[PDB]
Amino acid sequence: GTKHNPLPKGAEIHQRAPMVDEMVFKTAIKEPARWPERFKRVPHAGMKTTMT
Amino acid sequence: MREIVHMQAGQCGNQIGAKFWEVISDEHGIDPTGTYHGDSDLQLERINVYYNEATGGKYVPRAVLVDLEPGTMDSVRSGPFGQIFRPDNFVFGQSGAGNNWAKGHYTEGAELVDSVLDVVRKEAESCDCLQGFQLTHSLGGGTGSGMGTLLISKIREEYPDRIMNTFSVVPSPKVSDTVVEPYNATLSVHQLVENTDETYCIDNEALYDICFRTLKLTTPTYGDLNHLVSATMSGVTTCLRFPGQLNADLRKLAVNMVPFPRLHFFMPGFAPLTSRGSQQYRALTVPELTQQMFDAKNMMAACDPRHGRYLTVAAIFRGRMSMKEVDEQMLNVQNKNSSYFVEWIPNNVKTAVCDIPPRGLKMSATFIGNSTAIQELFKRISEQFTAMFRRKAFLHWYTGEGMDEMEFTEAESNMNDLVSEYQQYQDATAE
Amino acid sequence: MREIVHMQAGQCGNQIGAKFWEVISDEHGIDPTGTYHGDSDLQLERINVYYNEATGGKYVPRAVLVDLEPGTMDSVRSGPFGQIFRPDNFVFGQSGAGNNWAKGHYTEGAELVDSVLDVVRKEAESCDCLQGFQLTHSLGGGTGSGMGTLLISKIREEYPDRIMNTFSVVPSPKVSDTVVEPYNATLSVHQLVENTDETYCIDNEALYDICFRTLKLTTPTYGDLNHLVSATMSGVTTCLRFPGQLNADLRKLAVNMVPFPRLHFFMPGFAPLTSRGSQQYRALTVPELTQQMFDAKNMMAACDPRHGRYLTVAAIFRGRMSMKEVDEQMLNVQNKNSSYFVEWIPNNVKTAVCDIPPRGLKMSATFIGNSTAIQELFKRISEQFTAMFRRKAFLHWYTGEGMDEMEFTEAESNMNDLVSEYQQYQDATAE
Amino acid sequence: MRECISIHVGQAGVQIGNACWELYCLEHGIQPDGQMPSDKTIGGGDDSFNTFFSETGAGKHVPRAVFVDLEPTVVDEVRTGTYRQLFHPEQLITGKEDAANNYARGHYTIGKEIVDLVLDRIRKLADQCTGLQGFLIFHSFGGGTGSGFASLLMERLSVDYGKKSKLEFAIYPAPQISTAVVEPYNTILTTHTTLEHSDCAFMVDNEAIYDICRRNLDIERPTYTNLNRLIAQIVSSITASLRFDGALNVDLTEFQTNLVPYPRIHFPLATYAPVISAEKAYHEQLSVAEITNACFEPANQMVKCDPRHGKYMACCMLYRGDVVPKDVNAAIATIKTKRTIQFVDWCPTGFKVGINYQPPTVVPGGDLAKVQRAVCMLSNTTAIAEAWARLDHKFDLMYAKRAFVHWYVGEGMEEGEFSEAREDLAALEKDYEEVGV
Amino acid sequence: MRECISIHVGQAGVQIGNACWELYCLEHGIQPDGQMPSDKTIGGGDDSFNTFFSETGAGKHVPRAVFVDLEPTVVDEVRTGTYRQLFHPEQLITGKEDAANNYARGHYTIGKEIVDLVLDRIRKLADQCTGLQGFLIFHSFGGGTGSGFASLLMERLSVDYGKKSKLEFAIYPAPQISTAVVEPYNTILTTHTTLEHSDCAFMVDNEAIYDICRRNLDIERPTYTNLNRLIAQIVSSITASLRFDGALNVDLTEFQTNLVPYPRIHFPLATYAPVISAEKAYHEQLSVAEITNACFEPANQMVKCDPRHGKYMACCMLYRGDVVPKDVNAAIATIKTKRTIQFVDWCPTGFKVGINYQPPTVVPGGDLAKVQRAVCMLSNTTAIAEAWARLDHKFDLMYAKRAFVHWYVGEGMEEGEFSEAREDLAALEKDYEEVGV
Amino acid sequence: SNRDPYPFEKLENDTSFFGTNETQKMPYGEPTHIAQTKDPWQRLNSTCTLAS
Amino acid sequence: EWDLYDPEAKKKDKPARVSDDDPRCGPSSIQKFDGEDLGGKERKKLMEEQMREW
Ligand SMILES: Nc1nc2c(ncn2[C@@H]2O[C@H](COP(=O)(O)OP(=O)(O)OP(=O)(O)O)[C@@H](O)[C@H]2O)c(=O)[nH]1
Ligand SMILES: Nc1nc2c(ncn2[C@@H]2O[C@H](COP(=O)(O)OP(=O)(O)OP(=O)(O)O)[C@@H](O)[C@H]2O)c(=O)[nH]1
Ligand SMILES: Nc1nc2c(ncn2[C@@H]2O[C@H](COP(=O)(O)OP(=O)(O)O)[C@@H](O)[C@H]2O)c(=O)[nH]1
Numbered sequence A: 001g002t003k004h005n006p007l008p009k010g011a012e013i014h015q016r017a018p019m020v021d022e023m024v025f026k027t028a029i030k031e032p033a034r035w036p037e038r039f040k041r042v043p044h045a046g047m048k049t050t051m052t
Numbered sequence B, C: 001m002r003e004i005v006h007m008q009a010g011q012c013g014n015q016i017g018a019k020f021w022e023v024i025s026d027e028h029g030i031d032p033t034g035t036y037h038g039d040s041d042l043q044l045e046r047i048n049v050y051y052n053e054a055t056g057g058k059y060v061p062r063a064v065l066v067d068l069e070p071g072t073m074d075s076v077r078s079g080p081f082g083q084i085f086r087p088d089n090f091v092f093g094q095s096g097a098g099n100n101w102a103k104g105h106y107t108e109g110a111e112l113v114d115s116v117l118d119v120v121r122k123e124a125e126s127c128d129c130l131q132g133f134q135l136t137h138s139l140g141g142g143t144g145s146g147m148g149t150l151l152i153s154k155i156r157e158e159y160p161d162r163i164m165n166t167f168s169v170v171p172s173p174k175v176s177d178t179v180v181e182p183y184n185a186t187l188s189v190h191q192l193v194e195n196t197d198e199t200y201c202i203d204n205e206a207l208y209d210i211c212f213r214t215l216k217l218t219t220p221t222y223g224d225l226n227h228l229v230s231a232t233m234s235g236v237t238t239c240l241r242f243p244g245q246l247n248a249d250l251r252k253l254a255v256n257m258v259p260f261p262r263l264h265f266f267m268p269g270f271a272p273l274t275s276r277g278s279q280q281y282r283a284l285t286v287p288e289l290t291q292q293m294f295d296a297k298n299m300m301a302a303c304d305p306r307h308g309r310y311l312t313v314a315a316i317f318r319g320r321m322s323m324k325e326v327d328e329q330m331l332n333v334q335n336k337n338s339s340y341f342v343e344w345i346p347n348n349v350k351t352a353v354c355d356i357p358p359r360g361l362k363m364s365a366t367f368i369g370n371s372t373a374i375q376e377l378f379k380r381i382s383e384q385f386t387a388m389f390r391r392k393a394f395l396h397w398y399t400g401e402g403m404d405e406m407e408f409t410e411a412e413s414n415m416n417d418l419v420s421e422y423q424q425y426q427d428a429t430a431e
Numbered sequence D, E: 001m002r003e004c005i006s007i008h009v010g011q012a013g014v015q016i017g018n019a020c021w022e023l024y025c026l027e028h029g030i031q032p033d034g035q036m037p038s039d040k041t042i043g044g045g046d047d048s049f050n051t052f053f054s055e056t057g058a059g060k061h062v063p064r065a066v067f068v069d070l071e072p073t074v075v076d077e078v079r080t081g082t083y084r085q086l087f088h089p090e091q092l093i094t095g096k097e098d099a100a101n102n103y104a105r106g107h108y109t110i111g112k113e114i115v116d117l118v119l120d121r122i123r124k125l126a127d128q129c130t131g132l133q134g135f136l137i138f139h140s141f142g143g144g145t146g147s148g149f150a151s152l153l154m155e156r157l158s159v160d161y162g163k164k165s166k167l168e169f170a171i172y173p174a175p176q177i178s179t180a181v182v183e184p185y186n187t188i189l190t191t192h193t194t195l196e197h198s199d200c201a202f203m204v205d206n207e208a209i210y211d212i213c214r215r216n217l218d219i220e221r222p223t224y225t226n227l228n229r230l231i232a233q234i235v236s237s238i239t240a241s242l243r244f245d246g247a248l249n250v251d252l253t254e255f256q257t258n259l260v261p262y263p264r265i266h267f268p269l270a271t272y273a274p275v276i277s278a279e280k281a282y283h284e285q286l287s288v289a290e291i292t293n294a295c296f297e298p299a300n301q302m303v304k305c306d307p308r309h310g311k312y313m314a315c316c317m318l319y320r321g322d323v324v325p326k327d328v329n330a331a332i333a334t335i336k337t338k339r340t341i342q343f344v345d346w347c348p349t350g351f352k353v354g355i356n357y358q359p360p361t362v363v364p365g366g367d368l369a370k371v372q373r374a375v376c377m378l379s380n381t382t383a384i385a386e387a388w389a390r391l392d393h394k395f396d397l398m399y400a401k402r403a404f405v406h407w408y409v410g411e412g413m414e415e416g417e418f419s420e421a422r423e424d425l426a427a428l429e430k431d432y433e434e435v436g437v
Numbered sequence F: 001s002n003r004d005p006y007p008f009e010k011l012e013n014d015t016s017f018f019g020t021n022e023t024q025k026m027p028y029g030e031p032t033h034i035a036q037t038k039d040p041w042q043r044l045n046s047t048c049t050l051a052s
Numbered sequence G: 001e002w003d004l005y006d007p008e009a010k011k012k013d014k015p016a017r018v019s020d021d022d023p024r025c026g027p028s029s030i031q032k033f034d035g036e037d038l039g040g041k042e043r044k045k046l047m048e049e050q051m052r053e054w
């Protein structure tokens, strides 16, 4: 073909953070993401088993 | 041990289970990235009921996502906790159910059922002590009414003794939203009554009324409805997932709520529910929880328990309370209005008190009732079915796919048999 | 120190060997020039199995590349990792094959057989305890079928006590790259039955299946198809090159998977194999490797393992792992899928365990199966042969180069005899 | 992954295609030379154009439409105007002689010269598809290319693409306003290709759209451009659920299964609300209750026909914009309680709702105001038999004198076509009467 | 070193050679003076020329061709044109008088004077080579030197060289278009050498290439230059598997073995079909499925006979460029599951797929668009018997009352030769129809 | 075979437009040598061109 | 042998591949194939531009 590679194999920019398949997951996620709200637990009856 | 395989069929089941996984991961401390960042070891000791351990702190839910259209896959990946699911469990066909029970069951659901059974066998043979299969779906559609009941069938006659429960968003005359809802519901209730073990029977009308009247909520939308349903699904298994004074898992619930095998159609209810205007007028007590459970407006089914008789009642309380107060508050609600309970089942109330309330709540309580008022929903579906089937309206769509009208005849007749069975078992005397 | 000499016949066999030698060189630390640049001392301990020590730190692969057209030899000689082979094993003609089994077996190719046997005898004399011969070639082509089968016949005649294994890329009726594939495959299978010791059937349709529905891969081309076969070859041969708790050479595999002499057509597999999205959700353990290894969507033959009975199964594991969980997984698969395992052979599964994983992995597995479902592929090839043989189409090419129709009839009769033998031992009862 | 193939036949089909593809280019943000810039498509995915447009090898987008006409006038208007580089030159097929308001000329003489070419182009546009929702055939009943050649094309499409759905949008003649003398003959002759070769037939009426643009858009002299823009709004609202994301998404198969009760009964009435103007949009709050009550009024219908004397058999609500699925249920409850909508006895639940979260786009130089919410109402009603009875009366008025028959007989049509077509339409309106009772 | 000798007989052969060696030089970087700079060579080419051109050891790349024509007009136009210094002077061979559309004057008189000189030049070009794959013979059936002298020459190559493969790119008379009167006689008389002195006999029809040029490349007025450029593109796409790398690259005898089922059946059709103008290529993907369906579309064939009236027997695809096999397999599956493409029952698998890693080169001033993917499909169908029967009837209408026979009789060629050629034509036709049934 | 060697995105086809046209397999009929001894295939295999 | 039956063995483990440029993934671990067209988007864009200019 061409004598010089138009896009050399070493000069590629891979994605970065979590790699995802584009074959089954067509839409991409722009991910600074909103996590849901966290109800603060009740401070004295949150995790206290009746045994303890 | 005591593993549960979750399955969500159709758009409604997918959205409801997505809210369910948000609620469950919030309760267990799982981050939206999938890692565990909780505060106590009680969130980690029973994590294997719904989750699989991966490398690091990753937890993958044991859920199978089925729908016949690819748009639901985008709609369920658009949510928070959308990347926690394994991509191998995203089993989606490239077509669309078209609100057709025959499409979902006989033509294109048959091409997807082998792959869904393969991935459920994947999620089932990895469990050492697999307990049951839960399915969330909606009767009235094409995948929940069709593919969902087909999945119920193959999972049943592959696993005999495992506890099957379906949550079953049944249609309603007032919400409507679909003309062929009577056909889909009538064709699906036949597979519901023969191949399941606990059917929970939610509908959108009672969900709107709950989100509408005791919560105000000027814009009710669908997320709040799925939140209520998800809270109920968490409350029916909090005794399985957390230590408590009285433990009752799904097997004990099926023992204590099913007198006869074709009587497993329950009505749910979850009752620390008040509006934010009424929020500061509360006492926050076990009698308040029990009373707002047994109030005949917080039922997630439009059936009125006053127009019926309670065969069995299950109450799963959650938090730090006293057994004396719990037993007194579920004994006086038999002694006062004993006329709404069956005489031939004495003390027909089973209580299960856990010790870890949901995150942010002091006390919560889940109500399950096997009342004989489910015949109201079934009779409304039948009276809407027998108007269409008399003139055979919209029948060519179903019968051009190999289906016969004798199948509709069986669906209507066996549903009438279920209605008559419920009426006989509510009008039967002691002796 | 049991030496194995490699043969690469045809374009497909040469490219498969090209991938095989670079995966072996990455496992054993040899760079493309030939120098050992590894770190562990266990790499340069059994290097004499595949590598002959030249002057200095140079290690020449013990491989013979055979072709008739110079194109594939020029490709493998000018491509990356192509200067490690000795430039006297590149034996080729100047004419072509024309996808003609007669041009591979009787003329053109038969003139090169003396030179190929010369260089093969030199490479065999270079050994001390040569265990056997390995061949990579494709049925359905030219020199891959005819010249490969002639080489197998001559080597079996010269050394009739050595383990001969072929890797036999069989044609598929769904990829369909050549019209005369039924003739070449039918004439080559007949030679493969009575000459080789074991034959690992490779199918391009199943390779594309495991490239598309397992690894996604978008555009897989031939590189991935050769990579999978090369990894399977390394996983088969790892017990001669690295130590372990439970070792098994090729003769052990042949003894424990060949019940009757005309039963050696195998179904290979390799099963750490997951896509980019599912890397993080997959946890690499022995039950996961066992499940993917016994999955029907992971075989490299076009068979359905659930369409027949597994006569023998062998799994070669690699890595630090529990022999207890390895054994109970190899037994658990039998107890669940006991209907797909034949009854008159109790515990159909052989276990080999090596303690050295492939470079970059912590554990790996390799499947070799002798199921009675390879009669499906043989029946497809036989029916295509008789369909284009009833009208004697494309037969003047084969009969104008010294081949009678008696050879065609004998090949068809013997291959149907092989199919009938597989069907008989599938349908054979216990007692 | 979804695609719909548009076939625009006739002059009315070509002009409706011009307005319709202007609307689609505005909706998907494609410039008239064919390039989509910035590829965001707010309220939808990246592939949201794939229903109507296809990528090329040069990064351009070409529509999945075929504009066929037997006359080189309107096709050359398309090939000369602003949307010149957007269309593939092979997609715009034209003849030499038009059918000249003659069903026989369009069906037996001139149509059997480019029927093979239009089928080949349809085959290419269907082979370049990955999921095919169906075909959208835009034509007029007024005669000629839109009746005879459309009949031939749909007869070939029904035997080739048997499984695929075939929606059609047909311009139906008015009770009084009309522009052709032989158009009762053409309309009677073209009933068979709409009864045995169509899966759903949206019939629009020029007089009804004239009255809508007169009393609602506040313009005294509307024209065919205005009519075609309002017609294109219907199909944009129909395919909104396929293109953009929403709460309740209804594709064409779910649409047909929830709309048509019987295979012969596939003729609904279309309406749109609001069709309000910019100055009138100042003075009322356009909410779900108002737009639903406007859709059921017997003045916003797009066939000159009173549905209060008929019975609604099924209705498809298609909401588009600032719509929450509880206001929908409130409006449906109010409609079910109010009297003039009388539903047929065999349809208890008579509504199918599709809610989309994308407000309709405004076309510059247009008349429709930019609105928060809109709704397209598609109702199968037993009242279209009034229009077909008017057509039968106008056809039997001339067939008794046997006027304008020598043209059809000379061009090749046997005289039994008129008799069997009038018999077919009489039996069909008898079928609607029997379904209604 | 996979050399092939190109022999161009007649004016139609010589003009194809002019349009073909231009493409070969511009593909391999050969200047018209005979040097490779470095730039115009394929990357990694180096010796990739060494199947069409030969080094002299100093830099000169002499083509491996013999241009023959009894008339000294067009060959001296070659000698005067831009490739004046490219060709060896002995490679371009002329007589004094042309055969004047007479098979007798091409085969028995006149043409029996330089056939030995042409054979000596062919022998020199043959023993200059080391790996001679075969001979590609370009001529026409219009008459004279392209029929009689090409018959004599290809006969003597058949009896001399033997095992070398003799491809024929013959130009066939059209069903209706013809530039001469005695073409039926000159085409009947030469079927023996295409029948028993050729290993493969690809045929092209000038009217079919005219129709392809008018529909696809938008040339309303094409000519022999465009026709010969398309033919040269076909031959380049055939031979590139001998020149450049590819995955399943074929070597002449490979697709002969995968193409001809029987020795008498070696007359396939050759369709190069990403054939399109640049303006129309701006609006399509030109993907693998598109360029595969365009081959089986029965309007892109270079012989005027649609294969829908016959059955396919062996299709060899020769793909060029960025064509991954994963798309070629899907295209082959779509072709197999097509309705109208019917394969013969005794050929279950009938696709010889070959891929080359080299996109087509484009000539400046050319009419084809610069695509990156190409298909040359060679298909053996039972539909060339239509052209055989058209030739047969046009021959019988003349031989019924013996028109123009005295010209053939007075120059050798006893009267029974016409009947013998007619009889073997009928035998070949019978063979094709009995294979088709 | 249930193995799918084709990519995920498959273009439409006659099997999706009209329907699946696969028919059945005829039982076998005459045996192989009787089928070989039919006239217009045995004649073609027997008669060979000079080039062949 | 505590590394082989540690209860937190999955807690203290790395999946197989982590990222697109894992040093572990070579030609033997076969978690890195050349078929994954990670530069395929840029190559496709180059082809669109090149067809456009042609
Ligand atoms: N709504 C609308 N209707 C149109 C338009 N153009 C034409 N029509 C309708 O078309 C009818 C006239 O017949 P045509 O559609 O022009 O006939 P044709 O399809 O071009 O076929 P030929 O008569 O052979 O040319 C009129 O009654 C109009 O109702 C338009 O732009 N908008
Ligand atoms: N495609 C194509 N065909 C040509 C060309 N030149 C001539 N022909 C064909 O050749 C036929 C006429 O016969 P010729 O080839 O000229 O005869 P000849 O081989 O030169 O021998 P003479 O009769 O002595 O001139 C015409 O019917 C054309 O179809 C050309 O440049 N391109
Ligand atoms: N509670 C609840 N109901 C829903 C939801 N989505 C849809 N529905 C109801 O389900 C009915 C339609 O079911 P559908 O989703 O189409 O089922 P499918 O076709 O199998 O996916 C409608 O009448 C809705 O009222 C949801 O997220 N929550």
Ligand SMILES: Nc1nc2c(ncn2[C@@H]2O[C@H](COP(=O)(O)OP(=O)(O)O)[C@@H](O)[C@H]2O)c(=O)[nH]1
Pocket: C009, C010, C011, C012, C013, C015, C016, C097, C099, C138, C139, C140, C141, C142, C143, C144, C145, C169, C177, C178, C204, C207, C222, C223, C225, C226, E247
């Ligand atoms: N897996 C794989 N198959 C190949 C490769 N090259 C060719 N094939 C297959 O081998 C068959 C042709 O065999 P071939 O290599 O030409 O044999 P030869 O004629 O002796 O060179 C074709 O059907 C291809 O599908 C390769 O690199 N990998």
Ligand SMILES: [Mg+2]
Pocket: D010, D011, D071, D098, D144
């Ligand atoms: Mg007109």
Ligand SMILES: [Mg+2]
Pocket: E010, E011, E071, E098
């Ligand atoms: Mg001349």
